[PDB]
Design a protein around this ligand. Structure first.
Ligand SMILES: *Cc1cc2c(cc1C)nc1c(=O)[nH]c(=O)nc-1n2C[C@H](O)[C@H](O)[C@H](O)COP(=O)(O)OP(=O)(O)OC[C@H]1O[C@@H](n2cnc3c(N)ncnc32)[C@H](O)[C@@H]1O
Ligand SMILES: *Cc1cc2c(cc1C)nc1c(=O)[nH]c(=O)nc-1n2C[C@H](O)[C@H](O)[C@H](O)COP(=O)(O)OP(=O)(O)OC[C@H]1O[C@@H](n2cnc3c(N)ncnc32)[C@H](O)[C@@H]1O
Ligand SMILES: CCCCCCCCCCCC[N+](C)(C)CCCS(=O)(=O)O
Ligand SMILES: CCCCCCCCCCCC[N+](C)(C)CCCS(=O)(=O)O
Ligand SMILES: c1ccc2c(c1)[IH]c1ccccc1-2
Ligand SMILES: c1ccc2c(c1)[IH]c1ccccc1-2
Lengths: 495, 500
């Protein structure tokens, strides 16, 4: 058997971050990665036509200080997602160009409804502990409702409901009826709230890595060399003995003092445990699916939308549109002009049955309508990735919690099981579901093990992160009117 | 590599029924069973104190003809669960003895609400195809709501809502808020409806197997001999070559023309697939958890409840009661007096913290109050099984579908993946979640492979089952009043129109 201090299961960002921290501490780490590549839910494809493209996780932003610090240490640079020109909200078959993070509404009733919806999500969020959403004072009430129910309750307008729906679909690549209100509200609040999560400028979509996010995992793999074992899917973990035994599908045996599980919680199901997992984890890892998304990048000779003062961001309401949300994916040099769009939630399932060429045509025709340009009909290249297909991801971006699960099982997610500690973005308390959360969880799990080894004190397991100098956070602000305008039922009570 | 025609993954009733059918058709079958035993979610414990006790699936009933036929063929007999004396509905700290399948109410408004709740469950069920619940006209609308939301819409009394909630908890060992309304309405409909599923006499809980339901799998294992491989958890299935390769955790390799997956759908995750599963299945097997239950059996010197004219059936409403439902589990001979109780859904999680001795005390104190009997405080023995703990079950009784899942993923539950066919009770179209469904699905998967091999025509894949002559099904009947009494909103609509 191959003997080491710690086996890290999964060479995604979380696993790689944990392995790098343990390696840097002088421990012998081995990273066992199921795939023939590192990066997991990050994947950067290189070819002459795109140079490079992120087909998985890509965007980083302010307050994601851990992924920015790790990336900078590995010699990576960020550039800003193009948000110079106008965003588009495409509503009832018409493009409404706008500026700012939130699509505007003109109907005064609809305005109150929209304002109240975003405000209420953050108000509810403020009662949900980041590290313990199940401790929210109304945790049971909110966990026992879907986002669909909450939105049906809150939204007096079809307009607000459709945008809130799009927002849920885009945040968590799931339907409003699929997810716990408590979990969703937690999810938003632990990314710093509605503005932070939805924003390009000053939000989660501000930046991308020059040369692609896959370089974070690739360059930690560069550092660790042969400590990374590719095509080593872990099938079995045995903690009955002095040392933990980790077995891979190619029959290899790894012996460690401790294990970090840096895989999506539900992919814990692909590992056979001895002894059995405790009851609550045994059931938890069956209750926590990942969302559904196809990431699609259409390439053009030029970023022709910029000529019409569109930045390439499109928010596209309604069932018919295959893509509800797009960003400009042009390279910082202004070449390899491209529009990135997500086919979200049920549409990922619906449109997966088409050919690549058919999806390209649907995307091109949608983009020609929304951008109002025939140039959208003349793609020079197309790249796409359906994350629903991935045995070793389960989906993207992340794990959602259906109604009732977070309150009953949420405490389990990072509870050590003897000498197995849990990393993975799902176990983060901030930007859980992001590359940031991956780094937070990997490093926290690694330091749980350093604490178990008597190498660090309890108070050093959870470590704050200095703010990035390259990507500083600007405060999230609201207006007096946004804070105090009445809800639609608020305005009715008054009449 | 160990070569055969069909590898069956899982030695529950479904995989055993599949293996038996294929074996009986002249094929070379292997059953790869993860545990040191067969039976899966069925498990008959034997010791001197209890003689035998089903800690898992136990009850069979009218319309469950496939399990009755399979059991009978294996030499098993059934007996009737005790329903001679009064059932108890325990609501708000008081016991109300009654007779008949549904706890009665006297309050006329409450009467219309209860009547309408049960009627509406079945009315909605009649819209849902057993084999394609996603084809219900309102499939999307019903699949996008929880049972909590549907009860909130339907129940105009707290009384009906509390009984309805208990009904859901008891039926699918899940909270009303955890489960799809479409799926739950399908689930009840595919068991023959509210009366059939809830009833002891003339329903799902009418009978038990003499000696325990574990005998079904054990006796099929005896028939198959060494073809059943215990402690062979499957870890890897490879379909990239001419023959399917199935690898187990101990590194044994099996080579087959075809595979039957007879494991709960989500436990499909414990297998690494080459090539990868198609997208829809890849995601479906992460979206379908099993419910949560502790089955608890408290033993007494005598079935002392019978002397107070109580059959041992207690429907116990509300949060404090660890157990919401009990049946007399006394042996047919009248000895090893016992009360079987379920600790359901969240209470299974909540009370698993306690010691066995502490759960026993809580159950006795409950039974003492519900039965008005100090004798309930004098148990002689106790057995329990928390199914939440089982790596190779995931829970009990069965897989539930959270909102949105059944319409998006439902269609691939039993869709073959190249040379893998899917059995297990979850893939049944009648009494899915039950031993009956396990038999239906195992046999159907087996016949799919027989069809793929050109051994039978397509029209023999799905086979009807002759009605058991031993457990005849009384039809489910409604009275004129039951069909036409207005809902509470129907009564209110009538009152509106009279005053006009
Ligand atoms: C897919 C996706 C993700 C994504 C997103 C868009 C798409 C289409 N956009 C994002 C974004 O713009 N910014 C961001 O921060 N995140 C975005 N996401 C999410 C992001 O990619 C993930 O949160 C992050 O990559 C998660 O990292 P983590 O390290 O937690 O998880 P992982 O990448 O899934 O890595 C797990 C690795 O484990 C291997 N694996 C799985 N099972 C096994 C077994 N049994 N044995 C060994 N290895 C295993 C996986 O192969 C993977 O490499
Ligand atoms: C647990 C339970 C179930 C139950 C119930 C009460 C409880 C507490 N009450 C019931 C009742 O009164 N009447 C009834 O008809 N059903 C009742 N249920 C449900 C019933 O037990 C189940 O529907 C039924 O037994 C399911 O049979 P099925 O054959 O579909 O599935 P299974 O029993 O889970 O068997 C699966 C087998 O597969 C093995 N396994 C799992 N993973 C693997 C891998 N990777 N490799 C190989 N084998 C695997 C399991 O060990 C199991 O044996
Ligand atoms: C009207 N809608 C928004 C449909 C429900 C009001 C919710 S509530 O009446 O405020 O609960
Ligand atoms: C008048 C308000 C009473 C609501 C009663 N409940 C049962 C709560 C809802 C009825 C739903 S529906 O309104 O019948 O669709
Ligand atoms: C709200 C709004 C937009 C996004 C998100 C949440 I996760 C993300 C990743 C890439 C593009 C866009 C998003
Ligand atoms: C409704 C009512 C009662 C039951 C069921 C559904 I699954 C069954 C198995 C054992 C006891 C009770 C039940």
């Amino acid at each position: 058997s191959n003997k080491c201090d710690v086996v890290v299961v999964g060479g995604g960002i979380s696993g790689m971050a944990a392995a790098k921290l343990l390696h840097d501490s002088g421990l012998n780490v081995v990273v066992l990665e199921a795939r023939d590549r590192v990066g997991g839910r990050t994947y950067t494809l290189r070819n002459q036509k795109v140079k490079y493209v992120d087909l998985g996780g890509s965007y980083v932003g302010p307050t994601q200080n851990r992924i920015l610090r790790l990336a900078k240490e590995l010699g990576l640079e960020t550039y800003k997602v193009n948000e110079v020109e106008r965003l588009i909200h495409h509503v009832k078959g018409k493009s409404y160009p706008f500026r700012g993070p939130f699509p505007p509404v003109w109907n005064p009733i609809t305005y109150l409804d929209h304002n109240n919806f975003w405000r209420t999500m953050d108000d509810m969020g403020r009662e949900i502990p980041s590290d313990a959403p199940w401790k929210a004072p109304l945790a049971e009430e909110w966990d026992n409702m879907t986002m669909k129910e909450l939105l049906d309750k809150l939204c007096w307008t079809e307009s607000a409901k459709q945008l809130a729906t799009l927002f849920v679909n885009l945040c968590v690549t799931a339907e409003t009826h699929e997810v716990s209100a408590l979990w969703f509200l937690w999810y938003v609040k632990q990314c710093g709230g509605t503005t932070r999560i939805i924003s390009t400028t000053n939000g989660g979509q501000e930046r991308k890595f020059v040369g692609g996010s896959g370089q974070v995992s690739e360059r930690i793999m560069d550092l660790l060399g042969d400590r990374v074992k590719l095509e080593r899917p872990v099938i079995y973990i045995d903690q009955t003995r002095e040392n933990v035994l980790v077995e891979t599908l190619n029959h290899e045996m790894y012996e460690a003092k401790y294990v970090i599980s840096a895989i999506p919680p539900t992919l814990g199901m692909k590992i056979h445990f001895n002894p059995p997992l405790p009851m609550m984890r045994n059931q938890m890892i069956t209750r926590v699916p990942l969302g559904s998304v196809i990431k699609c990048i259409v390439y053009y000779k030029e970023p022709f939308w910029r000529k019409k003062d569109y930045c390439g961001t499109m928010i596209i309401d309604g069932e018919e549109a295959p893509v509800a949300y797009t960003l400009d994916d042009t390279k910082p040099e202004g070449n390899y002009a491209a529009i990135m769009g997500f086919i979200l939630a049920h549409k990922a399932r619906k449109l997966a049955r088409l050919t690549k060429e058919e999806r390209l045509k649907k995307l091109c025709e949608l983009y020609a309508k929304v951008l109002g340009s025939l140039e959208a009909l003349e793609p020079v290249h197309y790249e796409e990735k359906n994350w629903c297909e991935e045995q070793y991801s389960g989906g993207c971006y992340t794990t959602y919690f259906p109604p009732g699960i977070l309150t009953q099982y949420g405490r389990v997610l990072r509870q050590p099981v003897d000498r197995i500690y849990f990393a993975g973005t799902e176990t983060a308390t901030h930007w859980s579901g992001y590359m940031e959360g991956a780094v937070e969880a990997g490093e926290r799990a690694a330091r749980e093990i350093l604490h178990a080894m008597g190498k660090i004190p309890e108070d050093e397991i959870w470590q704050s992160e200095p703010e990035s100098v390259d990507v500083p956070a600007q405060p999230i602000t609201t207006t007096f009117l946004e804070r105090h305008l009445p809800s639609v039922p608020g305005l009715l009570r008054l009449i």
